[PDB]
Amino acid sequence: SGATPYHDAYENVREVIQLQDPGLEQLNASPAIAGLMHQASLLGINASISPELFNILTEEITEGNAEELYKKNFGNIEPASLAMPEYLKRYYNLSDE
Amino acid sequence: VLTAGLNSQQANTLHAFLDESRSAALSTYYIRQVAKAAAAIKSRDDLY
Amino acid sequence: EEIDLNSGSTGDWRKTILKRAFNIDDVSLFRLLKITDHDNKDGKIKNN
């Protein structure tokens, strides 16, 4: 489905952190610690990237597993149906633009 | 651990935020996995 | 239940709710314990 890998525990953290430091200025001020986390992990502090979304973004797509991954991510949706622009609009809650 | 460190105003802000995000997630899931075919639910408005 | 209030205990949800109810961190909670009772030689209390 669409924006469903809702790792609530992740999000609870993401929001609390923004509440404690909206500009991450303390992070800037504490490089010894800030440098311990990968920038990709830090992306998730501002970005809505849950551990699973991260795992998805890091998947290797190759010809050898393209169908396998399709079943892993889209499951029973026929790729032909998915391919229809209208289906996608709904699937991902996107505006026409 | 982190939640416990918030003040009241922040906690209320947090809870409101999270509930809104939770709804979008529950709704998206519901439509795909729970909604029954007889109900032509193709959107959150239809879900409503 | 034994609630481990040692400042470095990395506790459970009960430890956390106390922090939230009190609006304090682990270090403060540990000292708080010692303030109320200096005979508690552990960081642990019962959920009394």
Q: What residues of chain A lie within 8 A of the CB of B13, using their CB?
A: 19
Rounded CA gap, C11 and B31, in Å?
38
- Backbone φ and ψ of A3, nearest 5°: -80, 70
Neighbours of chain A (3+ CB pairs under 8 A): B
A76 at interface of B, judged by CB pairs closer than 8 A: no
DSSP A46-66: HS---HHHHHHHTPPP-STTH
Instruction: Decide if C19 contacts C29 (C-beta within 8 A).
Output: yes
CA distance A58 to chain B (A): 22
Which residue in the set B5, B18, B42 is minimally distant from A12, CB to CB? Answer: B18
A82 at interface of B, judged by CB pairs closer than 8 A: no
Rounded CA gap, A36 and A50, in Å?
19
Instruction: Decide if A45 contacts A28 (C-beta within 8 A).
Output: no
Q: Return the structure tokens found at B32.
A: 């795909």
DSSP B1-48: --GGGS-HHHHHHHHHHHHHHHHHHHHHHHHHHTS-TTS---SHHHH-
Residues 17-46, chain C, touching B (beta carbon < 8 A): 17, 19-20, 23, 25
A15 at interface of B, judged by CB pairs closer than 8 A: yes
Q: What b/e sequence results for A33-42 when a residue is b if at least 16 CB atoms lie within 10 Å of its CB, and e otherwise?
A: eeeeeeeeee
Which value in Å is the resolution of this experimental model? Answer: 4.0
